[PDB]
């Protein structure tokens, strides 16, 4: 129960920080972050229910992979928005660690762990893309 509580709390922190950071990005990245928040809500629903409630699907992971591929062609906190995204990335890494702990303890959350790894990669890429576009 303790790993479940810690993972859900870390995911709540991650989605709160993403909700804070989405007000500094453009409309496209704001919509991407809102979809990410919805996916985090699904992951929290699955983890808090110990897998009884269905969580995210592989389609969301494919969506994250497509975003990573699209943005991969293009000190933390080069800009303020980049700093917000870097903070979100660190919290996403911590949430990934917590979900990995949950998966070992209960066997639920493989797709969630994959999604969180891809999410940390995407947050890093989005911060770098914001820095590049603002510099350009």
């Amino acid at each position: 129960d303790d790993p479940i509580i810690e993972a859900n709390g870390t995911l709540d922190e991650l989605t709160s920080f993403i909700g804070e950071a989405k007000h500094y990005v453009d409309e496209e990245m704001k919509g991407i972050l809102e979809e990410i928040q919805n996916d985090i809500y699904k992951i929290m629903g699955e983890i808090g229910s110990k897998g009884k409630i269905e969580g995210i699907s592989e389609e969301r992971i494919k969506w994250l992979a497509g975003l990573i591929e699209r943005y991969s062609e293009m000190l933390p906190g080069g800009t303020l928005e980049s700093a917000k995204l870097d903070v979100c990335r660190t919290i996403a890494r911590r949430a990934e660690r917590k979900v990995a702990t949950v998966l070992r303890e209960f066997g639920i959350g493989t797709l969630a762990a994959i999604y969180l790894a891809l999410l940390s990669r995407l947050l890093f890429l989005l911060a770098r893309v914001i820095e590049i576009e603002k510099n350009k």
Binding site: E58, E59, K62, A65, A100, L103, T110, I114, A117, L118
Partner: protein, 149 residues
Amino acid sequence: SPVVEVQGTIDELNSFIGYALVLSRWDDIRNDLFRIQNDLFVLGEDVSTGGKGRTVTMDMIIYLIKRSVEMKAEIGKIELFVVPGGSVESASLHMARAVSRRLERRIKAASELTEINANVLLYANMLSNILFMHALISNKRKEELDKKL
């Protein structure tokens, strides 16, 4: 050693996947199975060496996930409590999936005694899922061919 048991189960799963590939009649399924055999070599190297050598990358997991998404789109709604069998291709794929589940159990047992990268277990889970999808695709295509006549 638990790693020895994991490696033996990997070899058995590789044999079963090779048999299913021989029985398979579709290019995409056979390409997936051959890539899975190569990734099983990679995963065995990752487990045996503890990560010093080649390791299971996120790219392989993402490839499995993309193939699973495409096959889910092709299949449509999936019914619960599927009886394994139907055709020799689907039966071999179900046997390979059962061996893959056994490999997942062996990896979970071994991780409690030694350090194993999480990507290994993630890939094993995705491999079981993709083998289930392969079996469903084989059954669906066989049924379509039978309905053609």
